[PDB]
């Protein structure tokens, strides 16, 4: 089976000014991740891809383009979670039919679902698609917080391979590895890669890897090698780029940085501000010149 | 044009065991609201409706069935908000074409949208539909808390009539009324109806009105006439049933209570637990005898 | 036991520039509350008195001075709560010896105490002093939320008379009046008096009553009589005043307003900013011109 | 001026049944830390010492006792923070008069103090004593969170040496080390020692070091040498011990663990539960058997 460890970019999507997918531009983002960032894989349809603002047909279109463009050069994970469990099932089947290596699904949100509800939801996607699953935690956006016992119950399904941990609880992180050493863990906070890698994470799924893949791989590998002083430096420079990107607007700044690489990363999708201001464009141009040139 | 003040039930939906809509059962729920609960109107497609777990096609069907069953008997408000602004526009246009009296929209959620992205979302839905808009505030599910200055900005659009205040900040409630005396406020917490009415709210949109509609109108109408003592006792009795409903599980219990009336309110839609256990059914029946017989 | 229902000012204390107690100014604040604000009682040693920034001796001094000036002209409640239980027993005993009518105590804070620890704390102050107790709930400062079952445990001690409800949950508020109809509730949020009174609170303990006691009384009295329109208008003006007080600096503005009545309300105690800026003093004078002249 | 890097046990205090200090047992906790735990220092008067439950004189006695027992064998840091700045200055001078190597002070709590108020409070303690200061950050108890720009203001006083980072934000800890590379950082969460040491903290101040000081030093030193796999193994076993401790009652379990080494660690001080139950006593025994034998 395909190896899911390593560096995964959470794929960003190029949109036209009217909010439609810019396929050509999406293809240039995938090619940049594979050829330049040298990621081990892509995590498609996640929050970074502006996924929760799209229709079911557009999600399928994004899955088709990413698999068509990446082919078998890298690993591919498909994020198909939704508040609509039938939608999640139908997406999961589609990505399974396309050949994605594994599914992933955000905790169902909005409503306050009980834990048994959350487990039934994972079990149903798995059962209905026949594919392996990566639980996707992102407490800051869903408000859902899972504890060690709850990961154990999800892990009773043997097709659940592990978790995309976009959480800053390093105590929980450590406990997960202690209690389920065979389950994988992908760090989801790019600004906390080093500390996460010192606790044995198996890889990382990140939005800033779209532009900072080289450094990200460097932190990861240097940490895994015990080369902590060197890793910290690169995390320091990374975190200065990250800090500028968060202050200037995450999605637009990563898109403007890609444009400066000649990738037609296009606009954001509304209700997110679709166009950068002059100030955002000048600031990206300064981030490029300081950290990515 | 039609008056939107008064008592609106937040319409629950009947589902079949496989998740599909039970059109006959749904029709019965509407008929129960109109004929026995004597609501002034229905609020269709809100959270109570299990709306964010469905496809756009299923939300359109629910809107077609309510309009066709209720006719012009009562006021109809169509909640069409979503993380997908294109979907909000499409639903918005469909509800406007169906003849609903007004639209409503939840603040866009999941992503941390800025205020102006939120305002631009409301202005876009109005601009594509030409209908009046009710801002739907539900901080406990969204994580979005707007303040007086933000409500004023939203209220620059004249199509914005007011807000479904599903919040318990009674200082803010008072300030909205003092600041925008001509804008409407619907109370959203059924168990807090009297305190909200004492500050001048113009009506209430609630899920417990599907079964406790006679009592809700009395708290409201007695509070408005200053008969606070009588009002409080009815709110006392009402809160006993609400505490019962909440402890037994809100969606299923209101549906089971609907069944006890002769209404095929059905199952809940998955990822919510679709079937009531035997304990849940028994408790529904005790709530029936005690409070609604 | 003297009647404790009605309007109570949470007493502010006057401090000299060096942080010591200005006895003379303290007497003038007390005289202003009894004579001009026409309060039913004083709640001495609370949050508003700047109590938690003071030594055990200074707390005793304030209880001496308040009892000497008020004598038996009004009811006196003594807030003796602390993270230190020996200190709360010591203060409770001194205030009981001076003749305070009732004791009050904030839930022990800082550390996360269990509910049995909180209950043992109240029972210990009561058993050591022999006085009646008002449970002082203030979630915004303490982080402690208690429910109906816990209040019932607290109410197994018959010397606990009820709760200073400084919290915004109007559902919990209703439930408490319903479950424990003979226990008293004093509202703690001045800007939500009206809705609290509609739920049958028995009185109110508030910091703004040191300057706005005339209106405070009217809202409570008009609300309990069913004269809601009059009440609501007086709540609307009170809330304009309170919004300006809150925006200008709660503690300093009230003392600045007191000084415009000829009361030497003095400075705030450090770590709190001790002197009003020229802008704060100017805003106080505007508030006084518009709402208190 | 003496070196403050390294492993610091947040000293636990031995109380008698009646809550008074048991000086003999306090001396044995000190000799165990210095002689068997091999710490570099003690952090006296922190939360772990049950400090905010005591009187000023009792705070002074513990300062007197620990200095007198430790002498100049190890570094000593005196936590003197309080909501009473006057007390904080008085304890600060006393600790300075006894020869403590540095002071430390929790951000004033309970009231919602402003940043400039927080800064003025540390600058006053520094000015009145002439001692250096370690800013004590514990957001989960105080609710005070401070950012990069706030540390920068605090760091404008040269006598501020750094921070007792009792927080889980690893992005903020990376940014702190990047922005103020010469200011010290001590990790406050024992169970997150390793990831904290991977980001370059200069030492750790911890309550579990009273009994697990040998492993705590190994994790630190191993991580600083980039021996991540051994570090992790030892963090894992440490975290099973801490998990059991947290689950049984942190305060009573460390004392019971102490008593199983023949240290008379005594009772907790009330309002905390003073006596361990038979179940808490049997589980400490199991914890000693599995991890400290």
């Amino acid at each position: 089976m395909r190896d899911l460890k390593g560096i995964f970019s959470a794929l960003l999507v190029s949109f036209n000014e009217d909010g439609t997918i810019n396929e050509k531009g999406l293809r240039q983002i995938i090619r940049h991740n594979i050829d330049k960032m040298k990621v081990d894989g892509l995590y498609v349809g996640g929050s970074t891809g502006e996924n929760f603002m799209l229709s079911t047909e557009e999600k399928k279109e994004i899955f088709r383009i990413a698999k068509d463009e990446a082919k078998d050069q890298i690993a591919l994970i498909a994020q198909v979670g939704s508040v609509n469990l039938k939608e999640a099932v139908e997406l999961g089947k589609y990505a399974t039919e396309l050949g994605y290596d594994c599914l992933s699904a955000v905790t169902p949100f909005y409503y306050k679902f009980s834990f048994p509800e959350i487990k039934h939801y994972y079990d149903t996607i798995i059962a209905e698609t026949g594919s392996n699953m990566i639980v996707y935690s992102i407490p800051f956006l869903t408000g859902v917080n899972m504890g060690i016992e709850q990961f154990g119950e999800l892990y009773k399904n043997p097709k659940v391979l592990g978790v995309k941990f976009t959480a800053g609880d390093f105590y929980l992180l450590e406990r997960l590895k202690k209690a389920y050493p065979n389950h994988l863990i992908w760090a989801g906070f790019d600004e906390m890669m080093l500390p996460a890698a010192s606790l044995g994470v198996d890889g990382a799924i990140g939005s800033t890897f779209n532009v900072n893949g080289v450094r990200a791989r460097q932190i990861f590998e240097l940490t895994k090698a015990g080369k902590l002083k060197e890793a910290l430096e690169i995390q320091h420079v990374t975190n200065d780029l990250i800090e500028g990107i968060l202050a200037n607007g995450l999605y637009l700044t990563i898109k403007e940085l890609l444009k400066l690489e000649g990738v037609d990363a296009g606009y954001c999708r509304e209700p997110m501000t679709s166009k950068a201001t002059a100030e955002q464009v000048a600031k990206a141009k300064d981030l490029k010149a300081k950290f990515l040139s």
Side-chain angles (χ1 to χ4, degrees), chain A:
Chain A
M1 257 151 85
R2 191 124 188 181
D3 193 359
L4 307 175
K5 296 194 308 320
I7 312 319
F8 288 62
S9 271
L11 189 60
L12 279 87
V13 176
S14 171
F15 295 98
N16 291 311
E17 193 183 19
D18 72 0
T20 59
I21 297 158
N22 173 352
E23 164 159 3
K24 199 139 277 169
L26 171 54
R27 284 168 188 282
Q28 300 174 354
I29 300 194
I30 297 154
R31 283 253 73 71
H32 181 82
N33 272 286
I34 296 169
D35 301 349
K36 318 290 163 190
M37 303 298 83
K38 316 293 191 180
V39 297
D40 295 301
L42 300 172
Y43 178 92
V44 190
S47 309
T48 305
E50 280 163 273
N51 181 257
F52 302 101
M53 294 189 286
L54 307 183
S55 62
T56 302
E57 257 324 287
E58 296 168 313
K59 295 171 194 183
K60 291 184 176 197
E61 286 286 287
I62 293 150
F63 291 132
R64 173 190 55 88
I65 295 150
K67 170 61 184 192
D68 182 68
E69 182 69 42
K71 277 142 173 116
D72 276 312
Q73 316 144 14
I74 54 172
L76 296 173
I77 298 178
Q79 194 290 138
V80 298
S82 167
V83 174
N84 182 340
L85 173 60
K86 293 173 174 222
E87 173 190 34
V89 177
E90 171 179 338
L91 284 169
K93 296 185 149 115
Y94 187 60
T96 300
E97 287 153 11
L98 297 173
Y100 275 75
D101 307 289
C102 194
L103 307 178
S104 177
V106 59
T107 46
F109 50 100
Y110 188 85
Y111 294 106
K112 296 314 189 185
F113 291 112
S114 61
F115 175 78
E117 287 166 350
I118 287 165
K119 177 160 156 55
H120 182 247
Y121 158 107
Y122 279 110
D123 287 336
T124 307
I125 296 170
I126 286 176
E128 292 298 303
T129 60
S131 286
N132 295 327
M133 175 63 60
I134 297 174
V135 312
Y136 175 20
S137 325
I138 178 177
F140 173 71
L141 304 177
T142 56
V144 177
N145 284 284
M146 303 188 285
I148 273 290
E149 155 171 46
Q150 289 157 334
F151 277 101
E153 291 311 296
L154 304 175
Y155 292 173
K156 278 157 158 182
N157 190 316
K159 296 176 63 62
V160 176
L161 312 192
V163 53
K164 184 186 166 315
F165 195 86
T166 333
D169 183 341
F170 283 77
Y171 178 37
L172 181 51
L173 192 42
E174 177 277 326
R175 305 271 77 199
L176 276 166
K177 274 293 199 212
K178 169 62 180 37
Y180 315 103
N182 298 310
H183 287 77
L184 307 171
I185 306 185
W186 293 262
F189 270 139
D190 316 1
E191 57 276 37
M192 292 190 299
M193 188 184 232
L194 168 38
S198 76
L199 280 172
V201 303
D202 305 275
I205 294 163
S207 84
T208 64
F209 305 167
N210 285 272
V211 286
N212 194 48
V214 172
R215 294 199 183 85
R217 171 178 299 281
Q218 295 167 341
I219 291 169
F220 193 64
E221 283 169 0
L222 291 165
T223 303
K224 302 331 272 303
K227 287 157 168 149
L228 296 198
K229 290 182 209 134
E230 198 178 346
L232 187 60
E233 301 291 338
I234 312 194
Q235 184 77 74
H236 282 330
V237 178
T238 291
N239 282 17
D240 288 344
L241 160 62
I242 291 180
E243 187 190 281
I245 285 167
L246 293 164
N248 195 230
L250 184 78
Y251 306 68
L252 287 170
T253 307
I254 299 174
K255 284 182 186 176
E256 294 302 320
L257 289 179
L258 281 166
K259 294 168 163 136
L260 294 163
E261 295 295 326
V263 168
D264 176 31
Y267 301 77
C268 280
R269 167 75 160 238
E270 283 172 355
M272 282 198 189
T273 301
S274 50
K275 311 195 189 129
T277 55
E279 315 45 75
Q280 280 165 310
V281 173
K283 188 163 168 216
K285 164 172 183 156
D286 304 25
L287 292 175
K288 170 68 159 62
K290 189 149 186 186
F291 304 120
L292 298 162
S293 284

